[PDB]
């Protein structure tokens with residue numbers, strides 16, 4: 383579908399049977415979810431936001447359903463005020479910006 | 482244009498006769514550029530993202546050309562790690578997300 387920008391481009395996501403909302407964020411390199419126990423091994427990572435760096439945990443090959451579209455990839459988990467879907471997964475669902 | 486997300490959706494903007502690079506950013510409410518001089522009385526403003534708060538200077542009704550498309554709106558100026566074009570201006574240039 384086409385998603386307009388008058389309000390925040392937030393969509394339903396599904397991950398491990400969890401139902402959540404998330405931002406479709408063309409400015410995020412990476413996908414950052416609020417805190418949750420994901421399976422598998424995680425590595426610590428420092429990522430940049432507008433206010434500075436935060437420490438997060440990187441899990442790989444995590445499947446996630448975005449707006450009825452299957453995606454599988456790297457997911458970062460840390461102290462974010464919002465679930466954020468980044469370019470790494472946005473490309474997988476064929477998302478473009480148009481103007 | 483249609484812009485894909487395998488690389489950062491970075492474009493050239495023109496502002497105040499200056500050319501700059503900025504990130505097309507659907508997950509940002511606001512347009513935030515690195516420190517520079519703009520004409521006008523400006524309000525001190527605090528904004529927030531990942532890593533927390535940023536102190537910025539709010540300039541209103543600023544003309545800015547984004548990839549050939551003209552906008553006139555609010556530009557926040559401050560110690561952001563990267564220039565970003567947010568929804569306040571993405572909407573002015575008719576920008577949508579599509580998959």
Ligand SMILES: CC(C)(C)NC(=O)[C@@H]1C[C@@H]2CCCC[C@@H]2CN1C[C@@H](O)[C@H](Cc1ccccc1)NC(=O)[C@H](CC(N)=O)NC(=O)c1ccc2ccccc2n1
Pocket residue numbers: 405407409410411412413414429430431432463464466468506507508509510511512528529530531561562563564565567
């Ligand atoms: C998610 C992560 C991988 C860390 N990426 C980023 O954060 C990159 C970092 C880049 C380099 C530095 C400058 C910003 C760009 C773009 N950002 C993405 C980017 O799109 C980012 C995502 C985001 C959304 C919501 C909450 C937090 C963070 N937006 C923002 O930082 C902008 C700043 C603004 N006022 O416009 N934010 C917000 O719109 C915003 C909205 C509600 C909030 C509620 C509580 C706390 C913070 C909130 N921030």
